[PDB]
Amino acid sequence: KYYGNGVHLTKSGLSVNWGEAFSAGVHRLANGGNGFW
8 A cells, every 4th residue: 555655644644644553563463472272
């Protein structure tokens, strides 16, 4: 999803952008460390 170089993404919604990337990342963190399967 190359929505530009990144400069426009900052002024646009750097806050909503970072927070969105973190959410998805949380799933990877949870399903990685421990596991009963």
